[PDB]
């Protein structure tokens, strides 16, 4: 009987995919899918108390004594002859003469014109494939059911119904449009598909492909600079400039981990006590002079302001006690904006490269650099009248330096320092440009400018200027500072040590710096369904997005990063492949008499 | 009650030269006489080096593939009448790479190797009946 046979249609590859609770006992009934195989059932228990343990897989087995295995080919082109082979399987103990016949299905061509039974005798424990050749002429997919009905001697029947999907006309074509991206040449256009091989009706799936295509001094020697401040009001700064520079330089360079962690907390107390040691030398008007009785010196007040203002980010000082200190410096500004020493320092050695033919230029540059450093520590609230005159004071000071800077015929140390001071306080561009141009010409040629105290300092100040004005010049500059600083017992003086540590700290953070490297683009076009848009963010990997754009598309790539963008388009074309075998061929001719039950 | 003559040849000089494995498939109820195939193998001048026959299917391993149309034959018998008219198949698997097969067809002595289709167009219909 045709109807009695239990057609089998459920042929999944994974069915018991779920998740459920457990209470030591549950009887879940699983209906085995109508497939003949052994199933590798397994599971994982996820408990709040105990946790996970992978279960032991269970090898359930499902099998029928007499079955029919029909294995459809995956790609079945139309207008092409097809070979289907339902291999009858008979593991019974009885010789059976069964009949195989694909039920009449619309959209197909039955070789016999329909349900023509092909009686076949199957010796027990053996297979008797009954070749069936039906040419597919349907549109999308046809489900053909093979029914094996046995004789009345032992009536066991089987019926498999597997859905056959028929591919679209012709082969499939791929278009790969390799291109580039950049921050000029921003907007690009992809020409719309215009190939004449296009089948007018067919699947047109396209995909986009965007690729990001992306490309320290010794912690031992510098850590030795941490010394307990000692001496008079002058020497307390010699041991407190490197002490803050070393603490700061390793703070920015992230070299504290190399040193034992007690060292960091050992240094945070050298500065803490150091700040008190120099604070008690403060005069009534915040001069920070060498001695309480000795006359003040604007150089030290500027130098102490820079070091103390910089350290103010750590020690819980009083902002108002620092604001007054800046007031003293301003009051010493001369008519043209210069600064004159009221009392020179007892020891000229700490001055670094200041001593020389010209001093007022360097004093003006050094003080202004320090003077700005104190702007950050000013309270955001209050002192507005105090702040305002500060900008005027530096602006007046900058004008004098710019006038001197453009004049030329100045020393190397003056030339380098002037470049940084104007750069830091945002001097007028023309003065900035001429001052910067003055530095490069005066430069000398990782050969730049052992190194005496003069050359080492000026390099550090100049090196800072290049960072603020890093392209093959700062990188080639540090190679002289670091090489010059790596010598045993390097950084002889105090001004070079405090500032050289500053440049390398600044240079290191610049060189080892990373950005977002964004590259996101936009794809838009006027498709038949309307207007659609897409974007592909590539801040930090590669992306590909399925977009429905059947016409010319618009690209608006943006971002400092550069990469490769290519678009893939898929479609069908008119086939031209020969049906006849090209390399190896068979020719078989059957001659004789074949008896037929019925013939056209 | 029915004869066969399977013929195989290779163009050569492609770099894939090698043995071949015929996959001749017979009609319904056909099985080659083991006596005939056994005679092919035993001979000193042997072409079908290894053969296995069970029911319709027949494998004729060929040690040497000649460039020309030099080929072997054999006999077959039938027991159950064939209930429908159609073309059976065949296939020559390259012994070193069965993915470069060669599917071919054939049919009854008076019939053809294809079915009747009025296709020859965008519209496409067949006339088996």
């Amino acid at each position, epitope marked *: 009987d045709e109807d009695d046979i239990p057609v089998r249609s459920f042929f999944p590859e994974n069915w018991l995919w779920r998740v459920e609770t457990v209470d030591r006992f549950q009887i879940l009934t699983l209906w085995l899918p109508d497939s003949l195989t052994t199933w590798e059932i397994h599971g994982l228990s996820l408990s709040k108390t105990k946790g996970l343990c992978v279960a032991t897989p269970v090898q359930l087995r499902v099998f029928r004594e007499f079955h029919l295995h029909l294995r459809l080919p995956m790609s079945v082109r139309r207008f092409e002859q097809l070979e289907l082979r339902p291999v009858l399987y008979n593991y019974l103990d009885k010789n059976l003469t069964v009949s195989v016949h694909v039920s009449p299905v619309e959209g197909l061509c039955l070789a016999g014109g329909g349900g023509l039974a092909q009686q076949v005798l199957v010796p027990a424990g053996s297979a008797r494939p009954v070749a069936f050749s039906v040419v597919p002429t349907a549109a999308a997919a046809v489900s053909l059911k093979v029914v094996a009905r046995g004789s009345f001697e032992f009536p066991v029947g089987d019926a498999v119904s597997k859905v056959l999907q028929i591919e679209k006309e012709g082969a499939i074509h791929r278009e790969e449009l390799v291109y580039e991206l950049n921050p000029r040449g921003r907007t690009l256009e992809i020409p719309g598909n215009s190939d004449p091989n296009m089948i007018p009706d067919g699947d047109f799936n396209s995909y986009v492909r965007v690729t990001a295509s992306d490309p320290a001094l010794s912690p031992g020697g510098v850590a030795s600079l941490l010394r307990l401040p000692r001496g008079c009001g002058e020497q307390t700064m010699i041991y407190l400039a490197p002490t803050l520079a070393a603490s700061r330089y390793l703070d920015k360079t992230e070299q504290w981990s190399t040193l034992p962690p007690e060292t960091k907390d050992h240094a945070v107390d050298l500065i803490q006590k150091g700040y008190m040691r120099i604070q008690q030398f403060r005069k009534a008007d915040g001069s920070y002079a060498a001695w309480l009785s000795r006359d003040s010196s604007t150089w030290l007040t500027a130098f102490v302001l820079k070091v103390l203002s910089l350290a103010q980010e750590q020690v819980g000082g009083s902002p108002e006690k620092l604001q007054e200190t800046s007031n003293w410096l301003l009051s010493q500004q001369q008519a043209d904006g210069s600064f004159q020493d009221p009392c020179p320092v007892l020891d000229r050695s700490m001055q670094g490269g200041l001593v020389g033919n010209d001093e007022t230029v360097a004093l003006t540059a050094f003080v202004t650099i320090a003077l700005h450093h104190g702007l950050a520590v000013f309270q955001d609230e209050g002192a507005e009248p105090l702040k305002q005159r500060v900008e005027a004071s530096i602006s007046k000071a900058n004008s004098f330096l710019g006038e001197k800077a453009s004049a030329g015929l100045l020393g190397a140390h003056a030339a380098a320092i002037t470049a940084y001071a104007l750069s830091l306080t945002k001097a007028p561009v023309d003065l900035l440009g001429v001052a910067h141009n003055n530095l490069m010409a005066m430069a000398q040629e990782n050969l730049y400018w052992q190194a005496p105290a003069l050359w080492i300092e000026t390099t550090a100040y100049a090196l800072l200027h290049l960072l603020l004005h890093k392209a093959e010049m700062a990188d080639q500059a540090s190679a002289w500072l670091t090489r010059q600083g790596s010598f045993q017992g390097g950084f002889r003086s105090t001004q070079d040590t405090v500032i050289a540590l500053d440049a390398l700290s600044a240079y290191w953070i610049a060189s080892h710096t990373t950005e977002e490297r964004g590259l996101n683009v936009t794809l838009s076009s006027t498709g038949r369904n309307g207007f659609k848009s897409h974007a592909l963010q590539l801040n930090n990997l590669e992306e590909e997005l399925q977009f429905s754009l059947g016409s010319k598309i618009n690209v608006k790539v943006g971002g400092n990063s550069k990469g490769t963008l290519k678009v893939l388009r898929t479609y069908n074309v008119l086939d031209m492949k020969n049906t006849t075998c090209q390399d190896l061929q068979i020719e078989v001719t059957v001659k004789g008499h074949v008896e037929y039950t019925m013939e056209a | *009650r029915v004869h066969y*003559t399977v013929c195989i040849w290779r163009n050569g000089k492609v770099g894939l030269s090698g043995m071949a494995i015929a996959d001749v498939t017979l009609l319904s109820g056909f099985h080659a006489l083991r*006596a*005939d195939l056994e*005679k092919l193998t035993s001979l000193s001048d042997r*072409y079908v080096s290894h053969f296995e026959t069970e029911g319709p299917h027949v494998l004729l391993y060929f040690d040497s593939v000649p460039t020309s149309r030099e080929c*072997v*034959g054999f*006999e077959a*018998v039938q027991e159950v009448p064939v209930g429908l008219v159609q073309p059976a198949s065949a296939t020559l698997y390259d012994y070193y790479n069965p993915e470069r097969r060669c599917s071919v067809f054939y049919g009854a002595p008076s019939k053809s190797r294809l079915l009747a289709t009025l296709c020859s167009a965008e519209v496409c219909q067949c006339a088996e009946g």
Partner: nanobody
Amino acid sequence: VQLVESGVQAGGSLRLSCVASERTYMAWFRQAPGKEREFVAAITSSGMMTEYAPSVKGRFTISRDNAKNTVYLQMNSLKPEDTAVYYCAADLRQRFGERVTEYDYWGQGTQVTVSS
């Protein structure tokens, strides 16, 4: 692998027999002077199926002996101008019905004449 053949007024009959050591499908060929040889009939190894030349449909039949492994070709109702030398030959690849001359190790044949 050698072939041996041995064995009349018009309207008579003859029974030609060719003996081959090896048991195979050897067929019959005839050659007349001045013209190229043409086949008369053939028989397969098992002898189930045989074909005859179109000129001798239903007239010449072939049989084989399973013991001495020969071919028995009876020629009842001889047709007078069929005189020719008959050759029994075979190949080792069982190409039944291979009309054209692609048989190797040809036999010698025997002369037979028919008189009206």
